[PDB]
Amino acid sequence: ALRDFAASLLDYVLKKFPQAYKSLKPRVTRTLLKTFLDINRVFGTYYGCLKGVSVLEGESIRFFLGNLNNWARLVFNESGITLDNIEEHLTKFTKEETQILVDTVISALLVLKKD
Amino acid sequence: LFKLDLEDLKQQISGTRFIGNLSLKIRYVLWQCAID
């Protein structure tokens, strides 16, 4: 609840201050790209990162299209899998939070295919 | 005495997890440079 509230407070300050654009849009998306692109973080930081990606818009979300495949291949361990035993295969997370991640990674991906 | 340090270096780079973390970090630095 706090991640979903603070993510919708970041979008409030990207519109309250549009005169500071190109001075807190690339800074915040660089913070999110820096915090997101690793393996050794807890699940809630990844959830906050993806919701902060969701409260951005446009090509910046497309800017995270390329580096999502290797992110999934490192954080979800599909080492040669054939998508069949996915319910009881995986290693860091539990099943519920992996389902939350696969839900939220397309909750923001719908913005790039609706235009 | 550098043999134990070389073995500690080999202990922290071997496996699948380190090279994939490097592949994430170089993708971060390439996209961060190419953001503008």
Cα–Cα dist A53/B31, whole Å: 15
Q: Give the closest of B20, B31, B32 to A39, CB-based.
A: B20
Roughly what angle, to the nearest 10 degrees, separates helices B17-33 and A25-36? 170
Q: Give the closest of A33, A40, A79 to B28, CB-based.
A: A33
Method of determination is cryo-EM
Note the resolution in Å, 1 decimal. Answer: 3.9
Amino acid at A91: T
Put simply, the answer to whether A67 touches B31 (Cβ < 8 Å) is yes
Q: B5: exposed, middle or buried (C-beta count within 10 Å: 0-12, 13-18, 19+)? A: exposed
Cα–Cα dist B18/B14, whole Å: 7
Name the residue of chain A whose CA is nearest to B34's CA. Answer: A63
Which chain A residues touch B28 with a CB distance below 8 Å? 33-34, 37, 67
Contact B24/A39 with Cβ under 8 angstroms?
yes
Q: Is B27 on the interface with A (CB under 8 A)?
A: yes
